[PDB]
RNA sequence: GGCAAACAUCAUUUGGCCUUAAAUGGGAUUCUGUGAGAGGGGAUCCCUCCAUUGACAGCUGGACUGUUCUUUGGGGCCUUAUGUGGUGUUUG
RNA sequence: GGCAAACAUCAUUUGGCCUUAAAUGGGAUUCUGUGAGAGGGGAUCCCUCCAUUGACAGCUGGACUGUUCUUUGGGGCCUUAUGUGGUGUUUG
């Protein structure tokens, strides 16, 4: 019945910057607060226990302090691999309860994406569907816009995209937009293009192909 | 030395059962308390159950009380989670954790080691293996630039899929995107690698797709038209 | 955890045999080389024999070659020293020592842990246990001084002898002297304790003498007339 | 085979003094030299290996250096518990061979002896022998002279003495002189005394008794 | 005189197998308190060795060799001891 | 008013058994790079608790006591969890 209200939900900071995540407990927990780091696809690793003690093998740029019933985690010199979601937990009373989490992006310089476009394989069209893929490789920030134009007519409602997690080394994103059509509809048009707009692009970029070439 | 290996996950119908197990190494179970913590995809962390194999004492979250049964075999040095009467809202990754025992203490401390977890998806859909298609270059840039090629893994269920390139020998420059759920209620993802435009006509680039749910594996070399 | 326990020493007539053993804990013999090194009374240190139980390879000092045989049974995790055809000039303390194995090496390094050792005396005399007498205060000094009491251990053979006080409960201020060889070819030593002049009339102090060769054990109270 | 000539055989120095023991090798040994400390009656503990590396649990006031085929051990600030004998060893070739050793006495200030005299027990007189014990406790230096007087006539050659090893904490010695007689001879005299002369004694001291009481 | 060898002397010094296209060694910055032999491990960067992709040279292919350039890579299991270099002497 | 109990709140926090005369806790300086549970260890000094040998005191002996002096000593086997105090509210 103890609640760990953790804030902020998200933050981003440049490599080298100090960062503080905070967790306030509904009632007295006293030191029985731990802090965890969870990297995408990985299991949480324990960083801080007893509110201020580092678990063995945790870089010393991590630390924690207690102030009454407020607890803060501090990454004193943020590093590219520190992109993760961070969690507080109390173990003063049971049941144990966790904070809602805090996602930490790394802020790096603007990098425009390099763009690629992939026509559907002859191997797929024989199944009745055409998937057209547009690839936005290694950019920052995460905000990018992908429009699909089939014979220069803007498309609506037939694309879906997914974005990688921030690279633990260069702190960039990669985005994948797929344009799904029926073979029949696909064979009705010639020019397929994705047009990308992003912060480090002066003018929009379009990568295209003609169907049978 | 210290490791925990969950197994027993997978796809299961709603109303059905599943028995996860966590096999521990490098420490005695009897000198720890073991815990299951689940993570609904996207949401945070929910403690599920705990057990002190030294005493056999167990405790459960009120949201699994009476459907789940944590337990431990101290000789096998593994721990278990019986899951009965599952619902869709039980789909999550299920981690087990260790809390090291210490004689000086007066209650249990943090969770100091977590298994990588196993994926439990509760659905009415069935296992469908993926299809694999090439994503091949257009040949726009000459020897000055690098090219991108890839594999598209479409129409499969359930998660996950794993992609490697040239059998894991090519890793630099590779992005496997998160799968997206299709209008057809199926998953689809892409994996891409960038390579020098000059190496296409000689080098072989093959993608290794594995969908362990369906026991499916595909190797598809990717070259242009 | 890491310790070595010599046993098997004692008195032997010239021409006889003896089988010392060293029982190891806290490390595997197969990952070390074991060594016997003796110390002639007064002399320094003389390496005697070595063995690498991983290979079974042995080496001997030219001073024992063909009279001694080192060995090890890796199941007991102990090592042995057979001593045949013994001579007087073999009388010494015999330590066993360990050199930790290391894969990066190209020959063995220094001896990094030594057992406490055992005494092997090769003579024609026979063991007879000692006599023990109280050495009690004289009650000469007034409030300026503290008083001294003790035990005298006379007419014994062979070395060694061990003395304790209150079964080891009293140590501060205690000196056990080296035995000196008497005109009879027998040893004799004393052990004393310093105590406050005031504590005699109440406290009881007992001395524990042990001459393990003859299976001799004595406890003697030391108080005044 | 390889000879380890160690020097000096013995030395004495005050606490805090720097101390260098030297070991010269008959031929090339290269770094394969160890240094051992043997405290009296105890098993030797290893201090230095590879001519300069400290073994785990060795105080930093120890050090070793190599100069060609000469090797030195150094105590930069000598401490009382450092009273021991020190041994070099080569492990360059086999057989391994040791130095002759170096005993290290500690030189401290003068400390006067406390003196005691103990008549023989009635339990020993009933065995047929008389042992009279004179005790010199906790003095420095080791050089002390104990005389025996049986009714004020000096004794020679019917006594024997043994001395403790230097105490590893207060760096003092203790001495035991026993005057061994036949029972019958003991019943011939009345006054038994030991007379002690030592550096920290301005006048020489005698502790005596009358036979029995 | 070129050699071998034995010995002396000083100096330096982990050594293999299997699979592989290949299965080096060193330097720097930094993290890690023993979390498996801390004589460790991780990350990032530079050089070096091996292999490898382009390009270029060798008439042109296949090779193969090379390079002040370029691409991508360098696995697994072992080791329980006296090798190697210089100098000298002596022998064949 | 007083005492309980439950709850709220903040703070703090290992708990037993056996043997025993007794079976605390902390501080400073310094050595120890995990030697097997470092949340360690040792040394030196200090404070503190329990016991203890002497001194002074309670008429003297049991006994027993002390804001003072003094001697010496403080063992073993366990532990797998929600104790304790302050405050507030409610109830008896």
PDB file of C-alpha atoms in Angstrom, chain C:
ATOM      1  CA  UNK C   1      40.161 -22.188   4.553  1.00  0.00           C
ATOM      2  CA  UNK C   2      43.695 -22.447   3.132  1.00  0.00           C
ATOM      3  CA  UNK C   3      45.787 -24.475   5.592  1.00  0.00           C
ATOM      4  CA  UNK C   4      48.354 -27.294   5.803  1.00  0.00           C
ATOM      5  CA  UNK C   5      48.551 -29.751   8.697  1.00  0.00           C
ATOM      6  CA  UNK C   6      51.727 -31.748   9.127  1.00  0.00           C
ATOM      7  CA  UNK C   7      51.471 -35.016  11.011  1.00  0.00           C
ATOM      8  CA  UNK C   8      53.577 -38.121  11.404  1.00  0.00           C
ATOM      9  CA  UNK C   9      56.664 -36.652  13.036  1.00  0.00           C
ATOM     10  CA  UNK C  10      58.293 -37.925  16.188  1.00  0.00           C
ATOM     11  CA  UNK C  11      61.250 -40.004  17.348  1.00  0.00           C
ATOM     12  CA  UNK C  12      62.861 -42.775  15.277  1.00  0.00           C
ATOM     13  CA  UNK C  13      66.012 -44.876  15.698  1.00  0.00           C
ATOM     14  CA  UNK C  14      68.655 -44.740  12.942  1.00  0.00           C
ATOM     15  CA  UNK C  15      67.815 -47.040  10.057  1.00  0.00           C
ATOM     16  CA  UNK C  16      64.044 -46.853  10.544  1.00  0.00           C
ATOM     17  CA  UNK C  17      61.206 -45.359   8.518  1.00  0.00           C
ATOM     18  CA  UNK C  18      58.600 -42.609   8.954  1.00  0.00           C
ATOM     19  CA  UNK C  19      55.691 -41.419   6.813  1.00  0.00           C
ATOM     20  CA  UNK C  20      54.884 -37.735   7.281  1.00  0.00           C
ATOM     21  CA  UNK C  21      51.656 -36.443   5.769  1.00  0.00           C
ATOM     22  CA  UNK C  22      50.336 -32.974   5.039  1.00  0.00           C
ATOM     23  CA  UNK C  23      46.587 -32.509   4.853  1.00  0.00           C
ATOM     24  CA  UNK C  24      45.525 -29.537   2.721  1.00  0.00           C
ATOM     25  CA  UNK C  25      42.305 -27.500   2.756  1.00  0.00           C
ATOM     26  CA  UNK C  26      40.958 -24.641   0.713  1.00  0.00           C
ATOM     27  CA  UNK C  27      42.729 -25.514  -2.537  1.00  0.00           C
ATOM     28  CA  UNK C  28      43.017 -28.424  -4.948  1.00  0.00           C
ATOM     29  CA  UNK C  29      46.356 -30.260  -4.961  1.00  0.00           C
ATOM     30  CA  UNK C  30      46.059 -30.701  -8.733  1.00  0.00           C
ATOM     31  CA  UNK C  31      46.436 -26.899  -8.992  1.00  0.00           C
ATOM     32  CA  UNK C  32      49.584 -26.626  -6.937  1.00  0.00           C
ATOM     33  CA  UNK C  33      52.963 -28.170  -6.360  1.00  0.00           C
ATOM     34  CA  UNK C  34      53.643 -29.460  -2.849  1.00  0.00           C
ATOM     35  CA  UNK C  35      57.050 -29.361  -1.218  1.00  0.00           C
ATOM     36  CA  UNK C  36      58.791 -30.628   1.887  1.00  0.00           C
ATOM     37  CA  UNK C  37      61.447 -28.304   3.353  1.00  0.00           C
ATOM     38  CA  UNK C  38      63.354 -29.092   6.538  1.00  0.00           C
ATOM     39  CA  UNK C  39      65.174 -26.914   9.056  1.00  0.00           C
ATOM     40  CA  UNK C  40      68.058 -28.574  10.860  1.00  0.00           C
ATOM     41  CA  UNK C  41      68.111 -27.135  14.393  1.00  0.00           C
ATOM     42  CA  UNK C  42      70.226 -24.016  14.069  1.00  0.00           C
ATOM     43  CA  UNK C  43      70.788 -24.393  10.344  1.00  0.00           C
ATOM     44  CA  UNK C  44      68.680 -22.604   7.754  1.00  0.00           C
ATOM     45  CA  UNK C  45      66.266 -24.104   5.272  1.00  0.00           C
ATOM     46  CA  UNK C  46      66.970 -27.138   3.079  1.00  0.00           C
ATOM     47  CA  UNK C  47      64.530 -28.086   0.346  1.00  0.00           C
ATOM     48  CA  UNK C  48      63.933 -31.859   0.459  1.00  0.00           C
ATOM     49  CA  UNK C  49      61.391 -32.986  -2.140  1.00  0.00           C
ATOM     50  CA  UNK C  50      58.716 -31.689  -4.512  1.00  0.00           C
ATOM     51  CA  UNK C  51      55.735 -33.058  -6.465  1.00  0.00           C
ATOM     52  CA  UNK C  52      53.281 -31.725  -9.052  1.00  0.00           C
ATOM     53  CA  UNK C  53      50.168 -33.907  -8.522  1.00  0.00           C
ATOM     54  CA  UNK C  54      48.749 -32.721 -11.867  1.00  0.00           C
ATOM     55  CA  UNK C  55      51.503 -34.677 -13.646  1.00  0.00           C
ATOM     56  CA  UNK C  56      52.908 -36.984 -10.982  1.00  0.00           C
ATOM     57  CA  UNK C  57      56.367 -35.537 -11.566  1.00  0.00           C
ATOM     58  CA  UNK C  58      58.785 -35.570  -8.620  1.00  0.00           C
ATOM     59  CA  UNK C  59      62.241 -34.214  -7.786  1.00  0.00           C
ATOM     60  CA  UNK C  60      64.530 -34.878  -4.859  1.00  0.00           C
ATOM     61  CA  UNK C  61      67.467 -33.238  -3.178  1.00  0.00           C
ATOM     62  CA  UNK C  62      70.643 -35.214  -3.733  1.00  0.00           C
ATOM     63  CA  UNK C  63      70.693 -35.587   0.040  1.00  0.00           C
ATOM     64  CA  UNK C  64      67.618 -37.846   0.175  1.00  0.00           C
ATOM     65  CA  UNK C  65      67.416 -39.385  -3.350  1.00  0.00           C
ATOM     66  CA  UNK C  66      66.532 -43.074  -3.042  1.00  0.00           C
ATOM     67  CA  UNK C  67      65.913 -42.870   0.716  1.00  0.00           C
ATOM     68  CA  UNK C  68      62.800 -40.687   0.497  1.00  0.00           C
ATOM     69  CA  UNK C  69      59.741 -40.915  -1.705  1.00  0.00           C
ATOM     70  CA  UNK C  70      57.267 -38.054  -2.016  1.00  0.00           C
ATOM     71  CA  UNK C  71      53.704 -38.745  -3.259  1.00  0.00           C
ATOM     72  CA  UNK C  72      50.094 -37.561  -3.212  1.00  0.00           C
ATOM     73  CA  UNK C  73      46.620 -39.117  -3.254  1.00  0.00           C
ATOM     74  CA  UNK C  74      44.442 -36.451  -4.855  1.00  0.00           C
ATOM     75  CA  UNK C  75      41.257 -37.937  -3.383  1.00  0.00           C
ATOM     76  CA  UNK C  76      42.404 -37.403   0.191  1.00  0.00           C
ATOM     77  CA  UNK C  77      43.845 -34.055  -0.994  1.00  0.00           C
ATOM     78  CA  UNK C  78      46.926 -34.819   1.101  1.00  0.00           C
ATOM     79  CA  UNK C  79      50.625 -35.430   0.383  1.00  0.00           C
ATOM     80  CA  UNK C  80      53.153 -37.782   1.945  1.00  0.00           C
ATOM     81  CA  UNK C  81      56.892 -38.141   2.596  1.00  0.00           C
ATOM     82  CA  UNK C  82      58.232 -41.660   3.109  1.00  0.00           C
ATOM     83  CA  UNK C  83      61.562 -41.526   4.957  1.00  0.00           C
ATOM     84  CA  UNK C  84      63.684 -44.701   4.814  1.00  0.00           C
ATOM     85  CA  UNK C  85      67.174 -45.497   6.123  1.00  0.00           C
ATOM     86  CA  UNK C  86      67.097 -42.464   8.386  1.00  0.00           C
ATOM     87  CA  UNK C  87      70.253 -40.954   9.866  1.00  0.00           C
ATOM     88  CA  UNK C  88      70.977 -38.657  12.790  1.00  0.00           C
ATOM     89  CA  UNK C  89      71.829 -35.855  10.384  1.00  0.00           C
ATOM     90  CA  UNK C  90      68.112 -35.981   9.294  1.00  0.00           C
ATOM     91  CA  UNK C  91      66.934 -34.530  12.616  1.00  0.00           C
ATOM     92  CA  UNK C  92      65.010 -31.354  11.795  1.00  0.00           C
ATOM     93  CA  UNK C  93      61.674 -29.624  11.636  1.00  0.00           C
ATOM     94  CA  UNK C  94      59.919 -30.699   8.426  1.00  0.00           C
ATOM     95  CA  UNK C  95      57.560 -28.166   6.845  1.00  0.00           C
ATOM     96  CA  UNK C  96      55.322 -28.840   3.886  1.00  0.00           C
ATOM     97  CA  UNK C  97      54.633 -25.887   1.612  1.00  0.00           C
ATOM     98  CA  UNK C  98      52.459 -24.986  -1.351  1.00  0.00           C
ATOM     99  CA  UNK C  99      53.228 -23.169  -4.598  1.00  0.00           C
ATOM    100  CA  UNK C 100      50.009 -22.039  -6.288  1.00  0.00           C
ATOM    101  CA  UNK C 101      49.807 -23.143  -9.925  1.00  0.00           C
ATOM    102  CA  UNK C 102      49.434 -20.498 -12.615  1.00  0.00           C
ATOM    103  CA  UNK C 103      48.744 -21.162 -16.300  1.00  0.00           C
ATOM    104  CA  UNK C 104      50.764 -18.146 -17.453  1.00  0.00           C
ATOM    105  CA  UNK C 105      53.969 -19.534 -15.960  1.00  0.00           C
ATOM    106  CA  UNK C 106      56.908 -21.426 -17.454  1.00  0.00           C
ATOM    107  CA  UNK C 107      58.333 -22.755 -14.167  1.00  0.00           C
ATOM    108  CA  UNK C 108      57.140 -22.738 -10.569  1.00  0.00           C
ATOM    109  CA  UNK C 109      57.266 -19.621  -8.401  1.00  0.00           C
ATOM    110  CA  UNK C 110      58.027 -19.151  -4.669  1.00  0.00           C
ATOM    111  CA  UNK C 111      56.507 -21.175  -1.787  1.00  0.00           C
ATOM    112  CA  UNK C 112      53.452 -19.161  -0.863  1.00  0.00           C
ATOM    113  CA  UNK C 113      52.145 -20.946   2.262  1.00  0.00           C
ATOM    114  CA  UNK C 114      53.847 -23.130   4.859  1.00  0.00           C
ATOM    115  CA  UNK C 115      52.416 -25.532   7.387  1.00  0.00           C
ATOM    116  CA  UNK C 116      53.468 -25.160  10.991  1.00  0.00           C
ATOM    117  CA  UNK C 117      55.820 -28.133  10.653  1.00  0.00           C
ATOM    118  CA  UNK C 118      56.620 -31.323  12.543  1.00  0.00           C
ATOM    119  CA  UNK C 119      59.717 -32.357  14.453  1.00  0.00           C
ATOM    120  CA  UNK C 120      61.564 -35.495  13.357  1.00  0.00           C
ATOM    121  CA  UNK C 121      64.442 -36.512  15.652  1.00  0.00           C
ATOM    122  CA  UNK C 122      66.593 -39.533  14.718  1.00  0.00           C
ATOM    123  CA  UNK C 123      68.422 -40.780  17.838  1.00  0.00           C
ATOM    124  CA  UNK C 124      69.123 -43.902  19.913  1.00  0.00           C
ATOM    125  CA  UNK C 125      67.521 -42.634  23.134  1.00  0.00           C
ATOM    126  CA  UNK C 126      63.973 -43.542  24.124  1.00  0.00           C
ATOM    127  CA  UNK C 127      60.967 -41.431  25.084  1.00  0.00           C
ATOM    128  CA  UNK C 128      60.159 -40.962  28.757  1.00  0.00           C
ATOM    129  CA  UNK C 129      57.690 -38.329  29.879  1.00  0.00           C
ATOM    130  CA  UNK C 130      58.698 -35.426  32.097  1.00  0.00           C
ATOM    131  CA  UNK C 131      58.069 -34.414  35.676  1.00  0.00           C
ATOM    132  CA  UNK C 132      56.247 -31.177  36.532  1.00  0.00           C
ATOM    133  CA  UNK C 133      56.671 -29.135  39.736  1.00  0.00           C
ATOM    134  CA  UNK C 134      55.055 -25.894  40.911  1.00  0.00           C
ATOM    135  CA  UNK C 135      57.144 -22.740  41.100  1.00  0.00           C
ATOM    136  CA  UNK C 136      55.103 -20.638  43.486  1.00  0.00           C
ATOM    137  CA  UNK C 137      55.569 -17.074  44.768  1.00  0.00           C
ATOM    138  CA  UNK C 138      57.698 -16.452  47.830  1.00  0.00           C
ATOM    139  CA  UNK C 139      55.479 -13.619  49.169  1.00  0.00           C
ATOM    140  CA  UNK C 140      58.401 -11.196  49.597  1.00  0.00           C
ATOM    141  CA  UNK C 141      57.056  -7.978  48.062  1.00  0.00           C
ATOM    142  CA  UNK C 142      54.553  -5.515  49.547  1.00  0.00           C
ATOM    143  CA  UNK C 143      52.362  -2.967  47.681  1.00  0.00           C
ATOM    144  CA  UNK C 144      55.142  -1.978  45.257  1.00  0.00           C
ATOM    145  CA  UNK C 145      55.355  -5.183  43.216  1.00  0.00           C
ATOM    146  CA  UNK C 146      53.390  -7.925  41.475  1.00  0.00           C
ATOM    147  CA  UNK C 147      54.124 -11.631  41.953  1.00  0.00           C
ATOM    148  CA  UNK C 148      55.353 -14.410  39.653  1.00  0.00           C
ATOM    149  CA  UNK C 149      54.470 -18.111  39.543  1.00  0.00           C
ATOM    150  CA  UNK C 150      55.304 -20.987  37.264  1.00  0.00           C
ATOM    151  CA  UNK C 151      55.861 -24.648  36.394  1.00  0.00           C
ATOM    152  CA  UNK C 152      59.134 -26.555  35.869  1.00  0.00           C
ATOM    153  CA  UNK C 153      59.225 -29.419  33.331  1.00  0.00           C
ATOM    154  CA  UNK C 154      62.295 -31.576  33.987  1.00  0.00           C
ATOM    155  CA  UNK C 155      63.971 -34.744  32.687  1.00  0.00           C
ATOM    156  CA  UNK C 156      62.184 -35.541  29.431  1.00  0.00           C
ATOM    157  CA  UNK C 157      62.942 -36.724  25.870  1.00  0.00           C
ATOM    158  CA  UNK C 158      62.481 -36.196  22.978  1.00  0.00           C
ATOM    159  CA  UNK C 159      61.643 -32.709  21.934  1.00  0.00           C
ATOM    160  CA  UNK C 160      59.133 -31.137  21.591  1.00  0.00           C
ATOM    161  CA  UNK C 161      57.000 -30.129  24.570  1.00  0.00           C
ATOM    162  CA  UNK C 162      53.952 -27.866  24.793  1.00  0.00           C
ATOM    163  CA  UNK C 163      52.805 -25.788  27.788  1.00  0.00           C
ATOM    164  CA  UNK C 164      49.556 -23.872  28.366  1.00  0.00           C
ATOM    165  CA  UNK C 165      47.939 -21.977  31.256  1.00  0.00           C
ATOM    166  CA  UNK C 166      44.284 -22.143  32.383  1.00  0.00           C
ATOM    167  CA  UNK C 167      43.757 -24.246  29.236  1.00  0.00           C
ATOM    168  CA  UNK C 168      44.729 -21.117  27.308  1.00  0.00           C
ATOM    169  CA  UNK C 169      42.677 -18.603  29.332  1.00  0.00           C
ATOM    170  CA  UNK C 170      45.718 -16.717  30.749  1.00  0.00           C
ATOM    171  CA  UNK C 171      48.313 -15.383  28.295  1.00  0.00           C
ATOM    172  CA  UNK C 172      49.244 -11.808  29.180  1.00  0.00           C
ATOM    173  CA  UNK C 173      52.659 -11.832  30.824  1.00  0.00           C
ATOM    174  CA  UNK C 174      53.624 -15.438  30.039  1.00  0.00           C
ATOM    175  CA  UNK C 175      57.054 -16.739  29.006  1.00  0.00           C
ATOM    176  CA  UNK C 176      57.791 -20.392  28.215  1.00  0.00           C
ATOM    177  CA  UNK C 177      61.529 -20.755  27.981  1.00  0.00           C
ATOM    178  CA  UNK C 178      63.474 -22.856  25.478  1.00  0.00           C
ATOM    179  CA  UNK C 179      64.462 -26.160  27.018  1.00  0.00           C
ATOM    180  CA  UNK C 180      68.154 -26.677  27.675  1.00  0.00           C
ATOM    181  CA  UNK C 181      69.748 -30.119  27.424  1.00  0.00           C
ATOM    182  CA  UNK C 182      70.853 -31.265  30.882  1.00  0.00           C
ATOM    183  CA  UNK C 183      73.890 -33.243  32.006  1.00  0.00           C
ATOM    184  CA  UNK C 184      71.696 -36.377  31.852  1.00  0.00           C
ATOM    185  CA  UNK C 185      71.007 -35.921  28.144  1.00  0.00           C
ATOM    186  CA  UNK C 186      67.485 -34.896  29.120  1.00  0.00           C
ATOM    187  CA  UNK C 187      65.705 -31.624  28.441  1.00  0.00           C
ATOM    188  CA  UNK C 188      64.255 -29.275  31.018  1.00  0.00           C
ATOM    189  CA  UNK C 189      62.227 -26.112  30.598  1.00  0.00           C
ATOM    190  CA  UNK C 190      60.164 -23.676  32.609  1.00  0.00           C
ATOM    191  CA  UNK C 191      57.024 -21.649  31.943  1.00  0.00           C
ATOM    192  CA  UNK C 192      56.087 -18.636  34.057  1.00  0.00           C
ATOM    193  CA  UNK C 193      53.248 -16.142  34.352  1.00  0.00           C
ATOM    194  CA  UNK C 194      53.196 -12.695  35.897  1.00  0.00           C
ATOM    195  CA  UNK C 195      50.154 -11.820  38.011  1.00  0.00           C
ATOM    196  CA  UNK C 196      49.207  -9.032  40.411  1.00  0.00           C
ATOM    197  CA  UNK C 197      50.354  -9.644  43.978  1.00  0.00           C
ATOM    198  CA  UNK C 198      46.670  -9.405  44.988  1.00  0.00           C
ATOM    199  CA  UNK C 199      45.252 -12.145  42.742  1.00  0.00           C
ATOM    200  CA  UNK C 200      47.039 -15.109  44.351  1.00  0.00           C
ATOM    201  CA  UNK C 201      44.776 -15.447  47.393  1.00  0.00           C
ATOM    202  CA  UNK C 202      41.654 -15.789  45.225  1.00  0.00           C
ATOM    203  CA  UNK C 203      42.454 -16.863  41.661  1.00  0.00           C
ATOM    204  CA  UNK C 204      43.438 -20.422  40.764  1.00  0.00           C
ATOM    205  CA  UNK C 205      46.059 -20.752  37.989  1.00  0.00           C
ATOM    206  CA  UNK C 206      46.686 -24.199  36.469  1.00  0.00           C
ATOM    207  CA  UNK C 207      49.478 -25.058  34.006  1.00  0.00           C
ATOM    208  CA  UNK C 208      48.871 -27.574  31.200  1.00  0.00           C
ATOM    209  CA  UNK C 209      51.960 -29.515  30.100  1.00  0.00           C
ATOM    210  CA  UNK C 210      51.785 -31.905  27.137  1.00  0.00           C
ATOM    211  CA  UNK C 211      54.564 -34.195  25.874  1.00  0.00           C
ATOM    212  CA  UNK C 212      52.748 -35.830  22.978  1.00  0.00           C
ATOM    213  CA  UNK C 213      55.567 -38.364  22.149  1.00  0.00           C
ATOM    214  CA  UNK C 214      55.032 -40.329  25.403  1.00  0.00           C
ATOM    215  CA  UNK C 215      51.264 -39.574  25.594  1.00  0.00           C
ATOM    216  CA  UNK C 216      51.915 -37.435  28.690  1.00  0.00           C
ATOM    217  CA  UNK C 217      49.576 -34.710  30.025  1.00  0.00           C
ATOM    218  CA  UNK C 218      49.778 -32.880  33.372  1.00  0.00           C
ATOM    219  CA  UNK C 219      47.829 -30.068  35.087  1.00  0.00           C
ATOM    220  CA  UNK C 220      49.346 -28.462  38.219  1.00  0.00           C
ATOM    221  CA  UNK C 221      47.942 -25.716  40.445  1.00  0.00           C
ATOM    222  CA  UNK C 222      50.505 -23.077  41.465  1.00  0.00           C
ATOM    223  CA  UNK C 223      49.732 -21.265  44.726  1.00  0.00           C
ATOM    224  CA  UNK C 224      51.812 -20.345  47.847  1.00  0.00           C
ATOM    225  CA  UNK C 225      52.557 -22.183  51.136  1.00  0.00           C
TER     226      UNK C 225
END
